[PDB]
Amino acid sequence: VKIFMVRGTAIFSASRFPTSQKFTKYVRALNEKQAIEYIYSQLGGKNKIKRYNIHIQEIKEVKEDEITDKTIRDLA
RNA sequence: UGCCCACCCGGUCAUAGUGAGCGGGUAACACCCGGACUCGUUUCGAACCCGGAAGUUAAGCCGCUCACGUCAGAGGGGCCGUGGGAUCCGAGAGGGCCCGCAGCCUCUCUGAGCUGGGAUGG
């Protein structure tokens, strides 16, 4: 099932804060292609951000036994 | 020999400039000694001009160090533009993306006189 952790910069008028409540997200999906499509649609729909302005920098699978947030742990 | 170092005539016209301190000449470049004569000072042989040669490396001149100036290279920082495109965004002011190009200032470090034609010295 490969819980993924996607990190990157999204833009609205020179906006960059690489930490954990205005910059990046967590995703649970089979492969990397599925996880990226989720990030584009969720940020593009909820914040009106086109895909020009979303710059994904790091995507990597994290182990299910160590996640800071318990919301993504509970559906495992 | 030599080559480069001064001198005469230059080119480039601060990377070449300015100030301070120091180094260097038995020749050359100068300061220097003197005025009958050419010439001369609205006074002054100071300057210009003429005639000289005892003295000196103190000036000039050349080189070296250090301060500022100037031209570059590298690095930290402040500011920021633009030619083409879209039934792109926005009430507008303005902004984002695609293809094509950059610039200015300020600090810090490191260097910084090259060169053409002719008679003396090494």
Place of tokens 């930490």: A19
> Residue A6: which of A63, A68, A55, A64 has the closest Cα?
A55
Q: What resolution in angstroms, rounded to 1 decimal?
A: 2.7
What is the rounded CA–CA span in Å between residue A22 and residue A38? 17
Answer for A53: CB within 7 Å of strand B.
Answer: yes
H-helix or E-strand spanning residue A66? none
C-alpha R_g of chain A: 13
Distance A40 CA to B16 C1' (A): 64
Q: Please state whether strand B lies within 7 Å of residue A48 at its CB atom.
A: no
Distance A73 CA to B52 C1' (A): 113
Structure determination technique employed: cryo-EM
Q: How far, rounded to the nearest angstrom, does the alpha carbon of residue A37 sit from its chain's CA centroid?
A: 10
- Which positions on chain B have an atom < 7 Å from some protein CB? 95-98
Among candidate residues A23, A3, A1, the one with its CA nearest the CA of residue A70: A3
Give the DSSP per-residue string, A17-65.
--SSSSS-EEEE-SSHHHHHHHHHHHHHHHH---GGGEEEEEEEE--TT
